[PDB]
Design a binder for these strands. Sequence first.
RNA 1: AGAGGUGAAAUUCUUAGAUUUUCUGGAGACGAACAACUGCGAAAGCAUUUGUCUAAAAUACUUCCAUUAAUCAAGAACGAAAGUUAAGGGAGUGAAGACGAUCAGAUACCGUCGUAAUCUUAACCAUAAACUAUGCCGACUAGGUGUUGGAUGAAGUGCUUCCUUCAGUACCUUAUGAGAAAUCAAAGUCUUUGGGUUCU
Lengths: 76, 149, 98, 95, 85, 210, 127
Amino acid sequence: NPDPVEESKKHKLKRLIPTPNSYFMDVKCPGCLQITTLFSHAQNVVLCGSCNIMLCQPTGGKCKLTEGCSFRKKIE
Amino acid sequence: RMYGKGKGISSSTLPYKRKQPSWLKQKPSEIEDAIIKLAKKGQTPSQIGATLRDNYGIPQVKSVTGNKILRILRAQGIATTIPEDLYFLIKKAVSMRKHLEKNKKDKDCKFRLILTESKIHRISRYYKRKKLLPSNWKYQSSTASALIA
Amino acid sequence: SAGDNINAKLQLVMKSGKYQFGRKSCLKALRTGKGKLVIVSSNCPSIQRSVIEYYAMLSKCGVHDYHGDNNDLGTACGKLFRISCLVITDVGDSDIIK
Amino acid sequence: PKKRRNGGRSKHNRGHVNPLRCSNCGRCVPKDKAIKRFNIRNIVDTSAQRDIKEASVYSTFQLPKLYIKQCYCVSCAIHSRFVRVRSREQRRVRK
Amino acid sequence: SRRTKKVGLTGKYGTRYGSSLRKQIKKIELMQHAKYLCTFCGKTATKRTCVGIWKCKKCKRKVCGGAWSLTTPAAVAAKSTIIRL
Amino acid sequence: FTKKEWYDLKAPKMFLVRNFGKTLVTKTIGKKLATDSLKGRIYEVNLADLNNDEDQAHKKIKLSCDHIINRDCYTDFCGLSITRDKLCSLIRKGYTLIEGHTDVKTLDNYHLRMFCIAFTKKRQNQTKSTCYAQTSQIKKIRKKMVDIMTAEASKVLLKDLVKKFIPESIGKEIEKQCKKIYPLQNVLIRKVKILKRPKLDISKLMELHT
Amino acid sequence: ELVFGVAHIFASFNDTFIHVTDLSGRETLVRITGGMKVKADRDESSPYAAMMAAQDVAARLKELGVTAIHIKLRASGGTKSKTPGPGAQSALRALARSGLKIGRIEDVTPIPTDSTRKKSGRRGRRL
RNA sequence: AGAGGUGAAAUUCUUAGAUUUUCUGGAGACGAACAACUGCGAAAGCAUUUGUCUAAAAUACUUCCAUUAAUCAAGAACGAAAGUUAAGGGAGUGAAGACGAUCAGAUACCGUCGUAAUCUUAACCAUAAACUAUGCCGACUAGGUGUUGGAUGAAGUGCUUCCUUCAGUACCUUAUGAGAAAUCAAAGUCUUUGGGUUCU
């Protein structure tokens, strides 16, 4: 029954209601205490505001990110 | 797909939420100012939106400000005279023609050049059916090298 | 893409900044010191490129040897005539300086 | 009436395959259609291996092996009984 | 308007000599009378002066070349091999 | 015939048995010195019967008769090759084989061309039927292996180059580095050919014979 | 004291060449083949002819003084055929039985990494 | 002292040393084994290495434009092999041809040789069982086994497998689906007959 379908996350993009798989997050690089926004499935390299350091490596998917930091989904 | 085979359904699908994301406290005035500055520094609107999303964290500029990026770019009067897709097609055709001139034995490059110029003519016909491209515009294949302005 | 980047920067300055092409104009710009960057085509006659480099090194202005000939330099500038030498009086919002 | 679903060869997503030459008759046959036998065989029968061992030294000498890799056209393979005619239903079975 | 269907510059020969001979001489007269790129000044103004000499109308500079074209494949290949080193 | 006399064949110092066979030459009459004829002939001899170990029976060395004194020929390294049966046994359907070759000169100005061959491994948890590798990985492996077989064959002399062929150190090192790109099974220098050699120096020939 | 020669064995669906030289490959000691061991214009490739060829060369090697022999097997050539002819079996058999030391055996038939065109048309032989 | 070759043979080469062994140099060709019911390409077709140039596809995208699209008489690009023209090349194979055999005959099948051709360059030619004998675009309809290229999540050991998914690519079974049947997951959703379009 296709209306109240609940576990269509494993379904390919453009499900019954097409919703993108990407999202946005904030990264707290350890020892840097800086604020910036970051896109999952990004395509460019980024630099922090406080201390100039790389954060994510642009690849064909969700990037590699750095060795550490605390990265949290910023969906409200 | 226009030429060849393969459906290739890969694309980007916008989220259901049409409004500005709630977390975004950014203001449309500086969004437009940044878009103008970035276009002035010189980038096509597609990659303008790309770097806007990646480095400024403002997805779907149409959500932040109630219109499209090429629309504001035109409203500022600084939009280019040749649309992005037509310009890129012309650039690719120019490059492959330059290559063909040296290697005229590249039948495959000849075939692909024919396809590219067919696309150019169809796209230009559409763009001049719209008023946003002069009626006398033709794209003869000689001056296309400098036509990139 | 060793020439693609410089061609793109040239296209950007042609739109934004002010420039001048021609041996006489570029020589005058170097004399007055208003030149910031001089582009020399690979086709430039040896004497002309020599005097250009001497003027530029006197006036502390950079010289960039174009990868193409004067036809290619004109095409890159968007003109339909040979150029063979360029002076950038000012750079607009272009990264050609570095 | 299309005796075989694959047309007697193994060509798919392909226009042309380079032919090889039958090891028996020398006729050109497409590589995917040719019947290939990679036979690994001794130089000598077991009786002669015993004699080679007893006329050899190192007390561990191992008789070399022949790797031949023949390929045959349909007619040559059928005549050499490398393949059988088989029945209509058994024709589908490959292994 | 178009003056000849296919004879081209060989129309000066009328009906004399064979058709094959006229076509063969046309093929190379086309490139013997053409203008070539002067790599020294960049202007396509190099014309044949004599059987193996090519002069640029702008440079006033002349260069040894082929009988009917500024360059021949055998010479350009040799130059390429030399410059490879 | 009755006018032919035996000659002994000697092997260089780094080898084991040092006397691997006899050769025949006709009489020394006329302008035929019967030593010019003996000079510069090639002997293809296995390593099993040269170092008395079975595990190296798959390789054969070429020795070129370089000097003759009295009655024995001393020879020198002239080439290397693995045997056909082993080469064919190494090739099985389901794996991609890597082939590479390079030209390299040693400190002795000894110009060599070396061909090495490799195969892809199956690892343990694959549970598949094929071990094919992407052409990009093929290219990377070939580049890495050409560089490796060039560097350590160029920074070493010919004698120690041969004495490092003997333990196939090249294959061990190529594995130790290529574990991190694609697992490879038995990889060895398939063949070594002497492209050109310096003028004969009897001094160093006898130095490596003694 | 053990002295070694090299026997190039050539089995090619016709006369089986038996060719013993020294280690270098020059200085041929004895070449017998199978043509002179049978005078029927046939059976040149036969085991019958190969066996007498092999015992004859073994006798001559014994009288020459070489007692150990290496083997180099060869089949036709790079275009004709890859499989050794009927005579190789009996050549090796008789060389073993004749009593001389047999050392190392190796297959050396010329194998083209190329594909130079072989005889007969694309239709091949019709017999 | 024979060697080639054959179902036997012969033509042919061969005491001036053939065939055979080994080495050196040259030449043209080809690019095996890996090599697959695998990949790429509109089709023809495309397999030695490296470099440069060039394009394509899939995937990922909260990037841009916003109907720009589908199919197409005329017209255009490409179009195996053979063939034609002109230079070069010319090893091997080899339409023609010449021999030797077989046969009643054999101008054929077989064998020895061999011109054109095959190869490169520059032009023509525009045809093949150019075949999946199946035009292109779109929607829907079923399970399983694989396999190629991406992307997602997790677990054996920074490394590798499994899960999901897109796009190719085959195969097996199944049809109260079709078909004259062979068979077909399209050749189905057709007398319960009309998605669009071209050709015959």
